[PDB]
Amino acid sequence: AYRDQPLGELALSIPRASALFRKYDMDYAAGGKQTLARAAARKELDVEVIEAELAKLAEQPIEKDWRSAPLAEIIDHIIVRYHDRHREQLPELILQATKVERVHADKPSVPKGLTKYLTMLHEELSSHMMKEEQILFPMIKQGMGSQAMGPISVMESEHDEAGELLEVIKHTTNNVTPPPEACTTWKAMYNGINELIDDLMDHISLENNVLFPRALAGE
Ligand SMILES: [O]
Ligand SMILES: [Zn+2]
Ligand SMILES: [Zn+2]
Numbered sequence: 001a002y003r004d005q006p007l008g009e010l011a012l013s014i015p016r017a018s019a020l021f022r023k024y025d026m027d028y029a030a031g032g033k034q035t036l037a038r039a040a041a042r043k044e045l046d047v048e049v050i051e052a053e054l055a056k057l058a059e060q061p062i063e064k065d066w067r068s069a070p071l072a073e074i075i076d077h078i079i080v081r082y083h084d085r086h087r088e089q090l091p092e093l094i095l096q097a098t099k100v101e102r103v104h105a106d107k108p109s110v111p112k113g114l115t116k117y118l119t120m121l122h123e124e125l126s127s128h129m130m131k132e133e134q135i136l137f138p139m140i141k142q143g144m145g146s147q148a149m150g151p152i153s154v155m156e157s158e159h160d161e162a163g164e165l166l167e168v169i170k171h172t173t174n175n176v177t178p179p180p181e182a183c184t185t186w187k188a189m190y191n192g193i194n195e196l197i198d199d200l201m202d203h204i205s206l207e208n209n210v211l212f213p214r215a216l217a218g219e
Contacts, residue, residue: 002036002050002051002054002055003035003036003037003040003047003050003051004035004036004037005035005036006032006033006034006035006036007021007026007027007028007031007032007033007034007035007036007039008028008032008033008205008208008209009032009209010028010036010054011028011032011205011209012065012066012067012205012209012210013062013067014054014057014058014062015057015058015060015061015062015063016057016060017054017057018198018201018202018205019198020050020053020054020057022197022198022201024039024040024043024045024050025043026039026040026043027039027163027201028201028205028209029159029163029200029201029202029203029204029205029208029209030156030159030160030163030204030208032205032208032209036050036051066206066210067210071140071141071145071211071214071215071219072141074206074210074211075137075140075141075211077206078137078203078206078207078211079133079137081203082199082200082202082203082206083129083132083133083203085199086125086129086196086199086200086203087126087129089192089195089196089199090118090121090122090125090196091122092192093118093189093192093193093196094115094118094119094122096185096188096189096192097111097114097115097118097189098115099185100114100185100186100189101114101115103183104181104183104186107179107181109174109179109181111172111173111174112172113172114169114172114173117165117168117169117172118169120165121162121165121166121169124158124161124162124165125162128155128158128162131155132155135151136148136151136152136155140211140215143218143219145212145214145215145216145218145219146215146216146217146218148215148216149216152212152215152216155207155212156208156212159204159207159208162200162204163204166197166200169193173190173193176190176193176194176197177190178190
């Protein structure tokens with residue numbers, strides 16, 4: 001009965017359900033408590049079609065269940081797979097945007113402002129990830145999460161803010177769709193933005209749907 005399960009649960013139990021949700025712009029990362037039925041109702045989408053899509057994906061076995069992994073292992077994975085990867089992706093994308101805005105400034109379809117908006121995202125992310133790595137994650141590792149509800153809600157507010165900056169980047173790039181005039185840098189950059197959105201959503205999902213709720217529950 002997938003329509004009745006929360007998005008976050010579905011994304012964690014069905015391999016690549018996250019990619020299905022991305023296609024429909026369903027926020028499983030910050031909106032993970034919503035039922036699929038609700039999220040579908042909000043978007044005016046046929047849930048039965050989405051349920052069939054999920055059933056086909058569930059045919060693949062699941063590769064690794066983060067729902068049961070120890071919190072310290074989740075944290076080290078976040079740092080290596082997501083935090084450090086964002087520290088490399090974003091500056092690359094900023095450089096590519098700088099060049100595109102420079103060279104194609106006079107094309108009517110150029111994504112004007114993209115360099116600044118990627119830089120804003122990068123700046124918010126850098127300070128956010130440092131708070132996590134230096135202050136919050138160490139306390140969660142020592143089993144102190146159930147006394148950290150204040151801090152954790154602050155981090156979830158910051159995840160929501162990063163979500164808003166993603167929407168701005170989407171808006172500036174026509175939902176990350178290159179015009180017919182785009183060169184290979186411009187196309188590659190848009191592919192990299194999509195990759196960044198994928199990773200960021202999986203990163204935030206892992207924190208909002210697994211790490212933080214388990215830590216608050218006393219792990
Ligand atoms: O994060
Ligand atoms: Zn993080
Ligand atoms: Zn975070």
